[PDB]
Amino acid sequence: GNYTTAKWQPAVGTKWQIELLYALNDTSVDAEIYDIDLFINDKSTIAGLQRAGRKVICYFSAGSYENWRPDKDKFKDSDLGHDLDDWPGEKWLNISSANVRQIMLDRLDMARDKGCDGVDPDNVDGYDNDNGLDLTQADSISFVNFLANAAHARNMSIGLKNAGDIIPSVIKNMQWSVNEQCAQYNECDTYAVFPQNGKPVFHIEYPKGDKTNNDLSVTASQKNAACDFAGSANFSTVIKNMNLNNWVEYC
Ligand SMILES: *[C@@H]1O[C@H](CO)[C@@H](O[C@@H]2O[C@H](CO)[C@@H](O[C@@H]3O[C@H](CO[C@H]4O[C@H](CO)[C@@H](O)[C@H](O[C@H]5O[C@H](CO)[C@@H](O)[C@H](O)[C@@H]5O)[C@@H]4O)[C@@H](O)[C@H](O[C@H]4O[C@H](CO[C@H]5O[C@H](CO)[C@@H](O)[C@H](O)[C@@H]5O)[C@@H](O)[C@H](O)[C@@H]4O[C@H]4O[C@H](CO)[C@@H](O)[C@H](O)[C@@H]4O)[C@@H]3O)[C@H](O)[C@H]2NC(C)=O)[C@H](O)[C@H]1NC(C)=O
Ligand SMILES: *[C@@H]1O[C@H](CO)[C@@H](O[C@@H]2O[C@H](CO)[C@@H](O[C@@H]3O[C@H](CO)[C@@H](O)[C@H](O)[C@@H]3O)[C@H](O)[C@H]2NC(C)=O)[C@H](O)[C@H]1NC(C)=O
Ligand SMILES: *[C@@H]1O[C@H](CO)[C@@H](O[C@@H]2O[C@H](CO)[C@@H](O)[C@H](O)[C@H]2NC(C)=O)[C@H](O)[C@H]1NC(C)=O
Ligand SMILES: *[C@@H]1O[C@H](CO)[C@@H](O[C@@H]2O[C@H](CO)[C@@H](O)[C@H](O)[C@H]2NC(C)=O)[C@H](O)[C@H]1NC(C)=O
Ligand SMILES: *[C@@H]1O[C@H](CO)[C@@H](O)[C@H](O)[C@H]1NC(C)=O
Numbered sequence: 001g002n003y004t005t006a007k008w009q010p011a012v013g014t015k016w017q018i019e020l021l022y023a024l025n026d027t028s029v030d031a032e033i034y035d036i037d038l039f040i041n042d043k044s045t046i047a048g049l050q051r052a053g054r055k056v057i058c059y060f061s062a063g064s065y066e067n068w069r070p071d072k073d074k075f076k077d078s079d080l081g082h083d084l085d086d087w088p089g090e091k092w093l094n095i096s097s098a099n100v101r102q103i104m105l106d107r108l109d110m111a112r113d114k115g116c117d118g119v120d121p122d123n124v125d126g127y128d129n130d131n132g133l134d135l136t137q138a139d140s141i142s143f144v145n146f147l148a149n150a151a152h153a154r155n156m157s158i159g160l161k162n163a164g165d166i167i168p169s170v171i172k173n174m175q176w177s178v179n180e181q182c183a184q185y186n187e188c189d190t191y192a193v194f195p196q197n198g199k200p201v202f203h204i205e206y207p208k209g210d211k212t213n214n215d216l217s218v219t220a221s222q223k224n225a226a227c228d229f230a231g232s233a234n235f236s237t238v239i240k241n242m243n244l245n246n247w248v249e250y251c
């Protein structure tokens with residue numbers, strides 16, 4: 001068995017919340033799992049959630065350079081590829097680089113030290129984008145399994161962010177999927193293999209679109225499009241703003 005094990009395996013259907021825009025300042029949402037930013041949340045916030053019986057997944061970008069992070073200066077010029085979408089503040093990483101991999105180990109150390117129960121590593125799908133580094137599916141598979149073994153070695157769980165094409169090659173090392181918008185793009189069957197194997201899909205839809213963020217609701221039709229799909233009863237769906245601030249609705 002060329003995989004490592006995690007002690008925390010959340011159940012299919014576990015209710016969750018995700019808030020990545022700012023330091024978490026709303027724990028009123030009755031969700032068992034909170035996915036929050038690794039860097040901008042402190043140990044006391046994470047422990048406070050766990051004291052309330054919740055599990056904390058710590059988000060970070062494993063496949064992109066973000067120019068606002070406190071470790072941004074660790075990255076070398078040779079680690080960086082093309083902009084994610086025309087802004088140099090976020091760039092694709094050479095995920096095969098020893099230096100990139102060591103930075104991600106440093107970030108996993110931080111997650112462990114802060115008490116994170118699991119980690120949610122973003123942008124492991126450079127192969128499906130204009131990355132400028134000839135990234136491949138095999139590169140992501142190697143990288144994701146590297147991240148999973150490193151997280152498990154630090155007693156943390158991990159999951160696959162989108163990247164549906166590589167599911168067969170990493171799923172044994174994953175404790176969940178985080179999916180965005182499979183309902184909008186006719187791909188939820190791809191991700192349904194996770195609950196078929198006892199693992200949740202933490203599922204996000206963005207019905208207000210990519211330019212509107214507010215605390216107001218969506219239509220019943222937009223809610224039904226996000227919520228009702230084959231096997232959706234096994235997906236842990238949240239309806240969110242694209243900016244992933246506090247606001248959330250549940251199915
Ligand atoms: C958890 O933490 C987060 C993060 O700290 C909290 O969210 C933050 O809350 C702050 C305080 O409410 C907000 O500050 C206000 O920002 C208003 C516009 O901000 C724009 O620019 C910022 C700058 O970067 C930007 O970040 C914003 O982007 C976000 O929103 C857009 C959508 O708009 C998203 O697309 C995006 O992704 C971001 O999420 C945004 O674009 C700014 O106008 C405010 O200054 C106003 O208002 C203050 C109070 O407003 C009150 O006015 C009436 C007066 O009668 C009052 O009755 C009412 O209750 C209002 O609350 C006031 O103090 C200021 O002096 C100023 O007033 C002047 O302007 C208004 C017109 O708007 C006039 O009426 C007035 O007479 C004056 O002329 C604030 O600076 C942060 O934006 C917000 N940050 C984010 C990321 O959301 C969150 O609340 C926390 N949650 C909990 C539960 O605690
Ligand atoms: C461990 O080693 C394997 C083999 O060397 C790596 O490749 C992956 O192996 C799995 C075997 O389970 C393949 O999985 C899938 O099998 C089922 C059939 O029931 C189905 O979903 C597909 O037919 C699919 O092939 C997977 O395709 C294969 N991937 C590649 C790129 O060869 C695997 O990546 C290594 N690591 C882990 C964590 O498994
Ligand atoms: C991304 O990083 C990897 C690892 O640093 C680079 O792959 C190496 O390339 C050199 C040739 O320049 C070979 O000698 C090594 O054997 C390669 N290592 C591996 C693991 O394949 C790769 O070239 C980098 N990609 C880009 C676009 O610079
Ligand atoms: C590693 O993670 C596991 C799982 O979260 C931790 O085990 C938990 O420990 C607490 C406190 O003793 C118990 O209340 C839970 O029932 C345990 N959960 C499971 C699934 O075993 C463990 O403490 C963490 N640390 C180490 C060093 O293993
Ligand atoms: C959800 O998963 C369980 C166990 O994997 C399965 O028996 C059940 O049929 C699934 N539900 C739906 C609606 O597909």
Ligand SMILES: [K+]
Pocket residue numbers: 180
């Ligand atoms: K995204």
